[PDB]
Design a protein around this ligand. Structure first.
Ligand SMILES: Nc1ncnc2c1ncn2[C@@H]1O[C@H](COP(=O)(O)OP(=O)(O)CP(=O)(O)O)[C@@H](O)[C@H]1O
Ligand SMILES: O=C1CN(/N=C/c2ncc(-c3ccc(Br)cc3)o2)C(=O)N1
Length: 205
């Protein structure tokens, strides 16, 4: 398999966008954390799958650095992909970042070590058709960068998953992937673009 995403090599992130890059990394983690609780996952200091344990059930500020820093790199590369695709990222209203509310996660969405995700409540945020074809493209590219970075870490495909010999069945072309995983990814990058407009930024090629 040969994944190659958009080439962001020559793009430079502006320093004033390093904050929306971090806000985006927090929220996408909060969206990941919420759905993981819905899949029957709780907090724990050691990775026990049969016990529904995962250390990174804590808030974004408390993740280990080898895991936390990859999220901030994936956020940066998604921002650079927009600029590489010819989009200008501007700022529309700064008060939009203060007229931001978060979602009322029920009491069950409170974990053992006080971690309770609270993503931005962006259910009021509609997307134009051009923005739904861009989000669909963005989620496909996000798969290629994830696939190549694991291949560059030594990962190969396998019929079943192995967390030690680096094999994983999801390292396939985006058209080869199961539709359940595609949809999960397309939704996550949908909320990514929503976070930009939700924080008051504009995105037009
Ligand atoms: N699809 C995704 N979207 C956003 N963040 C993800 C992500 N997948 C993993 N992460 C990030 O990685 C951290 C969780 O560690 P990990 O990489 O092992 O995920 P995971 O255990 O769910 C993969 P698997 O589905 O195989 O179990 C979290 O902090 C999370 O933010
Ligand atoms: O097919 C797949 C694709 N994929 N995605 C890896 C995921 N890990 C971290 C992130 C991420 C995305 C956006 C932002 Br902003 C910040 C972090 O992407 C996976 O795990 N199997």
């Amino acid at each position: 398999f040969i994944p190659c995403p958009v080439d962001t090599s020559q793009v430079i992130l502006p320093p004033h966008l390093e904050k929306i890059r971090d806000r985006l990394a927090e929220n996408i983690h909060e969206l990941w954390g919420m759905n993981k609780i819905e899949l029957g996952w709780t907090f724990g200091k050691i990775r026990d799958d049969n016990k529904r344990q995962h250390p990174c059930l804590v808030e974004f500020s408390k993740l280990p650095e080898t895991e936390k820093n990859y999220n901030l790199q994936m956020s940066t590369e998604t921002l650079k992909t927009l600029l590489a695709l010819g989009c200008h990222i501007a700022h529309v209203n700064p008060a939009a970042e203060e007229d931001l509310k978060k979602v009322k996660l029920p009491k069950n969405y409170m974990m053992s070590n006080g971690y309770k995700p609270a993503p931005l409540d962006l259910s009021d945020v509609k997307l134009l058709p051009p923005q739904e074809i861009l989000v669909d493209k963005l989620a496909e590219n996000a798969h290629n960068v994830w696939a190549k970075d694991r291949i560059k870490q030594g990962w190969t495909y396998g019929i079943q998953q192995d967390l030690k010999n680096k094999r994983n069945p999801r390292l396939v072309p985006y058209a080869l992937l199961d539709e359940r995983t595609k949809k999960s990814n397309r939704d996550s990058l949908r909320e990514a673009v929503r976070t930009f407009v939700g924080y008051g930024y504009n995105i037009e090629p």
